[PDB]
Amino acid sequence: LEEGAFLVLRREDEPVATYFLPVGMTPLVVHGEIVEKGQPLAEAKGLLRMPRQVRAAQVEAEEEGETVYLTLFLEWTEPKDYRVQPHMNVVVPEGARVEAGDKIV
Amino acid sequence: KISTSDPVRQYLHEIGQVPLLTLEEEVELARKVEEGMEAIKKLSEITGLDPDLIREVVRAKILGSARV
């Protein structure tokens, strides 16, 4: 990311784990599974900020002990460009959503 | 004054103001024209009116006001 880290783990292939890291978390590339030993040894010190483009809403928490497991919504916007030729038409205005079947140009 | 150069600085002024973008605007307007053409034909269908008639009503509306 610009500011952020996605950590996923396919034991075999099934996405066995999907745990994200807000900046201020110190990652370690290929560690971890000595005995699953809670070894994404990422340090949390001070501010834990957010990537500014991707948003965090919908909160959930199952409360126990020293840490709670949390499940949320992660909507990162991907900048992807296109180029208009002479003969291309811009049917769409200055910012509007589009469907899977909703031709643009 | 002498109309040698008058309708030239007449023409070359708005062609000075609009010397078409060789593709962009050029075609931009052509398309619009055909858009009118067909709009008009389907309007003939919906109203039961004449194609050139609708054509001229449009024309009269655009130019502001005219005998036509």
Give how far A86 is from chain B: nearest CA, Å: 5
Q: How far apart are CA A21 and CA A50, in angstroms?
A: 9
- Cα B20 → chain centroid: 15
Q: Which helix (H) or strand (E) holds A61?
A: strand A61-62
Token pair for B67: 């005998």
Name the phi and psi angles at B47, rounded to 5: -100, -20
Residue B46, classed as helix, strand or coil, is helix
**Structural tokens at position A73:** 């919504």
Report the half-sphere exposure of A91 (CA within 13 A, side-chain side): 6
Q: Let me know: does B54 contact B40? Beta carbons within 8 Å.
A: yes
- Length in residues, chain A: 105
Cβ-Cβ contacts under 8 Å between A and B: the total is 6
Residue with token string 């030729």? A85
Resolution (A): 3.6
Q: Which two tokens stand for residue B41?
A: 């034909």
Cβ atoms A89, A105 nearer than 8 A = yes
Q: Chain A within 8 Å of B27 (Cβ-Cβ)?
A: yes
B34 interfacial to chain A (CB closer than 8 Å): no
Neighbours of B40 (CB within 10 A): 19
- How many other C-beta atoms are found inside a 10 Å radius of the C-beta of residue A2? 9
Interrupted backbone of chain A, residues before each interruption (C–N > 2.5 Å): none
Minimal C-alpha gap between A60 and chain B (Å):
53
**Closest approach of A83 to chain B, Cα-based (Å):** 14
What is the C-alpha R_g of chain B? 17
Q: Does A86 touch chain B (CB under 8 A)?
A: yes
Contacts 24+ apart (CB under 8 A), A46-50: A48/A22, A48/A23, A48/A24, A49/A3, A49/A22, A49/A23, A49/A24, A50/A3, A50/A4, A50/A22, A50/A23
CB A86 within 8 A of CB B27: yes
Is B12 in the A-facing interface, judged by CB distances under 8 Å? Answer: no
Inter-residue contact A40 to A28 (CB < 8 Å): yes
